[PDB]
């Protein structure tokens, strides 16, 4: 996260770290959506242009974390993966359309002060909240700059941007399964996701029921925190029918 700040303890208890077993390193962010299911970006698991194609046994999920590098004894919980499910129409060839994946845990994780699931939006909360100017929150242990790394989980709040502005900021083809967020050059403030934040959540706190909803997944950007560029996020509600299909069939 570029131009963010240290998270408070328990601020993002749905935050998940995807961790490579060998070598041991941060792979991506992710989020906890139930005691058995974790949501992430498909490109965290499958990205052929970079020879990335992880299998279940390659990774661990670490939940309840704050420190990036420490083993947080008595606080974090580490889970093995039972199965990975990638959206069948995930477009890794072109523009990361439908950049979404689910991971089922081998065993349910125990909730605690530090571990708790985020809500997924329904149509109404999505319609209400996904509007230009409305701010969400992005969290992760990714790089602090495009070109270093944080001691603890970072957080930044960013406004959703008008679709034509998103479209006009890039040569990449944008789709309805994406939205973009970030400050405009003239707005002064800044902030963005960066390498290592992929797969983490973009959340909004509903003013109607005071619950946090995951509206987006950190997906792609051109550099990090560049003037006139924006971060792109997977539109979770647009892909919710797939999420529910997977959970209903394999849950």
């Amino acid at each position: 996260i570029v131009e963010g700040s240290d998270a408070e303890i328990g601020m993002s208890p749905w935050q998940v770290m995807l961790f490579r077993k060998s070598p041991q390193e941060l792979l991506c962010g992710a989020s906890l959506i139930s005691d058995r299911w974790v949501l992430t970006a498909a490109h965290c698991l499958l990205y052929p242009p970079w020879d990335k194609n992880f299998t279940e046994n390659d990774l661990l999920v670490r939940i309840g974390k704050h420190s990036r590098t420490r083993y947080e004894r008595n606080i974090e919980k580490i889970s093995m993966l039972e199965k990975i499910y990638i959206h069948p129409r995930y477009n890794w060839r072109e523009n990361l359309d439908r950049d979404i994946a689910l991971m089922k845990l081998k065993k349910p994780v125990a909730f605690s002060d530090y571990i708790h699931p985020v809500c997924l939006p329904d149509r109404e909360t999505a319609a209400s909240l996904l509007q230009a100017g409305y701010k969400g929150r992005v969290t992760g242990w990714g790089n602090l700059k495009e070109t270093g790394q944080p001691s603890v989980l970072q957080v930044v709040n960013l406004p959703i941007v008008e679709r034509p502005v998103c479209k006009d900021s890039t040569r990449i083809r944008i789709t309805d399964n994406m939205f973009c967020a970030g400050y405009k050059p003239d707005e002064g403030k800044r902030g963005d996701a960066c390498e290592g934040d992929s797969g983490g959540p973009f959340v909004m706190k509903s003013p109607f029921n005071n619950r946090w909803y995951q509206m987006g997944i950190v997906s792609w950007g051109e550099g990090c925190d560049r003037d006139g560029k924006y971060g792109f996020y997977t539109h979770v509600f647009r892909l919710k029918k797939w999420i529910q299909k997977v959970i209903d069939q394999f849950g």
Binding site: K21, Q24, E25, L26, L60, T69, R70, Y71, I78, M80, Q149
Partner: peptide
């Protein structure tokens, strides 16, 4: 750069 995690999770 990461602290080692318990071996139970790497089996």
């Amino acid at each position: 750069d990461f602290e080692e995690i318990p071996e139970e999770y790497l089996q």
